[PDB]
Design a protein around this ligand. Structure first.
Ligand code: M1P
Ligand code: M1P
Ligand code: M1P
Ligand code: M1P
Ligand code: M1P
Lengths: 380, 380, 387, 387, 387
């Protein structure tokens, strides 16, 4: 029948999309390797999420639930597989979470047949987004995310003013999630991320109160409340992290220190511009900066530049294999998910040996002239 | 001569552009079919609008009047042809109206040799735009449009603050236009559209006072003044119509009710984002909502994402043929005109059977899980 | 596992290929419409024809039986579907027959899981090819094909000399084939095709007699046969002749059996000429009378189709060939033609358009001067009109 | 109406094709510059040559007279324009001649509305082709071409054997052609070309005698003719010879008539060799003396041009051929060459560059060892320089 | 200056071409992996082979010595690098040999600055081609190649008749070549290749005897030679035979010398058949016994590789040819094959995969019926599995 043929073609085209082999982009900077194709797009969502496949109730075979974007994904290595905790945004403008898995980390990502069922906390949330997964030493996988609600204090007619809390959920199988109480805090918090080890016998969170990225020790993750907050990485005038910054995924432990991936924001004539940057902190004291490479680590290139919210890169997930290979999962323009690959050694090299920002054009020129001089002497 | 050869090539290239066959995009969602090429672009404007073709006064053969964009077009089926009432924006940044016609509705649109001569109302307007055509049962074709003027109340140096009225013109041939008085109203009005039937023996307008899309009965279209205004379709926090919405073309009458096409706006880091959405109202009471499919009906895809004002779809025109075929004319990024095709039956199906927005991530997930469950049971 | 993933990808990519929607080429001549993609290629053969899918016996997952080409296909409308009787050439250089079916006639052709099992006649054949299907009024589907054998009577070291007979098989399900005796004949025969109606109560074959080398072979012939189960040509009449400096100079041959129209029998054939690059094969058409199928009533000049674009290149370049087409009740015609002995294409038209083409394309006057006069006549008419 | 819209689209698309600006290919060898597009293809022939534009007689708007190829064109600068004398091959396999003109020489070639009306000589010809135009000092434009006829003296069934004469026509407007008697000759003649100056007060032809098969045919010949209106070759001298294992091994032939330069006559020819795929045709150049046009003074080794890219493929693949070029007063040269007997291309150079190429491309020493020594000499010079 | 800028651009573009990273083609058959780009083309030859870079003597900066093709390359692993012994064909139609080296085997092949200087044997040769390199256990690298000469004993005008001997040269640095006497033989010999081990204390050659025309030539032969410095074939045994209606019907010939594996000698050859477009060349494999290298132990049916895509087209289209491959210690195999006598490609595999292919690709049963039965067996196994 024509209908059954149409369904068979939808499924077949979908498998071909899902199984497509990714290829590295051979032109790069020696730090990260980009890939030809996104790892996830709205089109990667299962056909059976979008279409009613029953001819009796959907004779025209049209989509019943539109999917708009797959972005800002958390990430975890799980029972030998590479997993993203994807922020999926429907056509209805709500986001929800969904696990997608790949055998190799760069392609053949496929969503689990059901998305994430996330219980509400005492106060229901309208939107949930940007989950950071932490396999904590206490044996739980924590997902720390943004829980957004309409701002009650807003003037009538204002349907846009919003408040956000740090939502805290934990799981041991990524299917059954226990919702702990929202992070209690005096200042509003976004980009909250759980450090994977106890520090002074306490849970440690990366925070962004709304100075920069902060550090807060928490006695009880099941009754989490920020008290003291220490700033780790600061905003600076005329850098890539001028207006805002925020921690991405939780940092990777290396013998040289904690390796961090964050985003920085500035304002330009086209709106806000988001890029990724890195920093390192000490193993002895994770609050202490030990590497501050100047500038951005990654910025939108090519197709990445354009989407629902253009001029944005964002990452809240990466995976480092035992052999040192690193898979960085980053969204572009709040629309799609990409992967970039590197190694711990290369990322540490980049962090340690990219000159620090001297904070002015003159300083930048002197750093550059020093490198040129060395190279010309070599090339002679 | 070299000049005459150059003119002959301009005309020949233009005819080739105008006559190019459009092709449907085979990948779609079963609701609407997109097409490979725009139906109109600035390059579609006649060569003789842009160039002085006289070698004596234009020996270099350069454009004398630049055309920048062809957007936000009204639409009407006219004496067997498919017509757009195009908003054409010159390089001089002013818009004017111009009729363009096609024999088939998807390609070979060609502008009438002269654009629209639109008489001013008592107070002259600086810009005119976004005309909605209504073949009213009173025998007139009405064009309801935006008439924009500089805001007199603005502080010195402010050359941007503007006011807008709803301009009202009518015609029986789309060449000779009678300008009626601007809509009188206490609140500023935009996206005003004439309903094609009398209601309670009165003219009925779709309005957007500046809550949502409104309905206003008007005794006399030649002395039009809004009194009572009823809200039909509301803005909602965290939907595609959060900050603004507005009626597109006048709705299509179907046996199931009035079929509406509108736009919804939200704000993001890149500015305002415009998408299209649909709703239905009752035949018995056109003020009563009877279908509210969740989310967007169409959003910018591919080339649509980029233009003078990126991240925008806008429609103020569509045509439904007697056989049920629907031609939807939508602009992308305030730059070019596109066509999408569907049918009344498919659009009604989409409106009735796309689940309503439950207004939260949890609700969205439950709706989705219900569909997944049905499909997996089927596919077993 | 990695192996199971590899198999899954092979199958998925294969389904994506098989299901790809064809699109017409909008640039055409108003007679036929070409399509963007071939309807069949070697890559369309099932994955399970080429690979051993068992990890134990094929751990590297390589092809065990290479497929080289899908060409020269017969065709028939069958229980509501569009069927090709494909000549499939393996990497081993042998051809065999295989049914492939489509719901619409222009795409989504899929091979039946098993190819054709064709019993040998008394003398075994080395290669079999180019089957023409005829749903004859006697209730059988006949396939008439070429059965080729090495010429044992060859100089030592000559492993190329061959002979060929017209093989005759019949079936009612396209799975179980009965092999009748090879056509008996004094000349070598090729491109033999069964006419679908009895004529004077006899079976009628289109023939192409030739000495080996065409030699004295005059063209496409007509032979009445008393008994298809003991077929032997006696008298044969030439219906469509070769001509110097036409597209059918060196050889010609009937393609599929002709289509009956109210205006006469509509024929599709191929014509051959020699050039510096070898032999060049194009398609051409002609019509014969309903009253007397041996009588030519339409001879449009020149070729009907010739290799265009990708068609020009393959194992045997500069060749178009057809031995199958389907005409639906509504007049729509699907022409299945191979290019360069490598792949199968479809072209579409209608009976009315093909008849128009045959009747109104001027006949060949056989010289440059004659060609120029015909052309000048048309130019003169057009220029007056365009005035 | 739908029909009128279809006609309008045919005409508009045709004008867009005709007016397309050509672009040079920036990758080259410094001798010639190739161009992105052909200057003529079958699709360049007027819409009103191919379609009947009258709805009453062609309601489906199909082509009535198919055009297959535009090739082997003569050329002449004419009243300020660049003209090709095109060999146009119809779908009917006959060739005829047609003038096409361009304002600039690299694009916007358009056929004159009518093709060439060429009167027959006393014995009618079946095919006519490959015309070389010579604006002779006697005030006439001559076209010397090949007139081909079937060889009546052929075995039965042989419809391919042909004979050919050198046809001679002259004109002063390229519309009204007077047909002189075919060249009388003891050997078959092909690629005959008229030298543009009297030599010893006689007409001089470039010739290419051959037994049929070239056979004893030594190469490109020179024959003095007393009276062009009663042309008969008596004595002929060979000017440019075939050589084993060069690009002109099996056959060669003059292309257009040579260009006079202060250094001598600049010649463009083609050379043929046989390979596994058939005959391979490339272009080559040579120069002869002003004092004695029979005397070779430059013989650059190897080919001047060979098929590149799209040129490699057509009705007769692996062929380049030229019988026309134009040199402007400023020294710019437009070379019109066909590829694969299918389409026409242009390549540009200058007289100085072409003379440079002929004089300084080392002569063929006729062996691998000799080729290596020439190459090692150049490498040695370059490496010293690059030091 | 403009000239110096032009030279700089030539050199820079050349380096960009030479350094381009090759990429594997992900669509394959699991046996061999093809690559997106050729490893060598005529454009890969050094800029200083083709252009005179001196402004004083080449002010227009044109090529003085055109390069036409890079084909049929021998190959050897050499001091850690991957080397091709390339047959380079000039525009002058002569071939000569030239070493090109790569660090990785799939890209960045660069010609040595000078090509090969090969001394003549007592009788000079006109063309030399197709060298197979053998690192023999006697400590020499031998190159066995074809040395071609005009057949002086030809009808007048015949400049195409040729004879060819097997040329024998040896070297220890690939720069200084000693030319031994041409192989003495009663039949013409071509595709002669040196086996890398003594057999019964003698040198062993793969041979391909033929009357001219292959004629009585049975296939690929084996000849024991007492003294490589005075090589003469006495008795020769045929190892791999031609067969009617296979890919090696008309001709066959050994490619590079075989690879020793624990399972036997792994052979790569080419096979030829005739078709309407001329001769068609494909690659095939076979294996012989370690105990007795004359004894066939594996004969996979059909072709190993045939022209795909861009490979189909060149100076001599429809040809694949290989006379070189390299197997690394880890089992990785680099197969260097020419397409269409025009360009060089690489394909990769492993010894295990190639052995798997040879052992488990079913043998040719030599008929359509036999091919169908083999295929039906595999289909039946697969369908059971897929259940
Ligand atoms: O809180 P942040 O650091 O400013 O990030 C926010 O903006 C990003 C860009 O739109 C989004 O990608 C994020 O989801 C988030 O809404
Ligand atoms: O009044 P609205 O609904 O906000 O629409 C306006 O913005 C659109 C997007 O730039 C424009 O396309 C429209 O022309 C209009 O100016
Ligand atoms: O018998 P014919 O008319 O000469 O056709 C033959 O040649 C064709 C072209 O190679 C092949 O396609 C055919 O299969 C056949 O071998
Ligand atoms: O006479 P020549 O030199 O062999 O040239 C002939 O062959 C050419 C190549 O097919 C054709 O292009 C020519 O028209 C001609 O038929
Ligand atoms: O001797 P063989 O086996 O017939 O091979 C010959 O033909 C090949 C194809 O043209 C060429 O590639 C070879 O160089 C050779 O001329």
């Amino acid at each position: 029948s024509l209908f059954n043929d149409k369904v068979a073609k939808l499924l077949a085209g979908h498998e071909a999309l899902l199984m497509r082999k990714n290829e590295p982009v051979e032109e790069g900077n020696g730090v990260i390797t980009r890939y030809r194709y996104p790892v996830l797009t709205a089109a990667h969502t299962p056909v059976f999420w979008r279409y009613d496949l029953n001819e009796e109730t959907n004779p025209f075979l049209m989509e019943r639930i539109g999917m708009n974007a797959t972005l800002n994904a958390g990430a975890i290595k799980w029972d030998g597989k590479y997993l993203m905790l994807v922020r999926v945004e429907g056509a209805d403008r709500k986001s929800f979470f969904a696990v997608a898995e790949s055998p190799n980390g760069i392609d053949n990502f496929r969503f689990w047949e059901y998305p994430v069922t996330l219980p509400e906390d005492v106060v229901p949330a309208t939107n949930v987004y940007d989950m950071r997964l932490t396999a904590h030493e206490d044996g739980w996988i924590y997902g720390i995310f943004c829980a957004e609600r309409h701002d009650d204090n807003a003037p009538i007619g204002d349907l846009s003013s919003a408040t956000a809390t740090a939502g805290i959920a934990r799981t041991k199988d990524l299917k059954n999630w226990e919702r702990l109480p929202d992070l209690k805090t005096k200042s509003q918090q976004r980009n909250v991320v759980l450090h994977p080890e106890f520090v002074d016998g306490k849970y440690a969170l990366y925070t962004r109160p709304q100075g920069g990225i902060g550090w807060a020790l928490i006695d009880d993750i099941t009754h989490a409340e920020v008290g003291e907050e220490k700033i780790i990485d600061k905003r600076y005038y005329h850098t890539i992290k001028e207006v805002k910054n925020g921690e991405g995924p939780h940092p990777i432990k290396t013998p040289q220190g904690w390796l961090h991936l964050a985003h920085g924001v500035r304002n330009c004539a086209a709106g806000l511009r988001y890029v990724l940057y890195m920093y390192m902190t000490s193993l002895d004291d994770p609050t202490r900066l030990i590497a501050s490479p100047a500038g951005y680590f990654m910025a939108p290139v090519g197709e990445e530049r354009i989407g629902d919210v253009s001029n944005v890169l964002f990452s809240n997930g990466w995976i480092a294999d035992d052999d040192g290979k690193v898979f960085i999962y980053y969204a572009s323009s709040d629309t799609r998910m990409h992967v970039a690959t590197s190694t711990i050694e290369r990322l540490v090299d980049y962090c340690l040996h990219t000159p620090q920002d001297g904070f002015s054009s003159s300083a930048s020129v002197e750093i550059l002239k020093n490198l040129i001089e060395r190279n010309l002497r070599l090339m002679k």
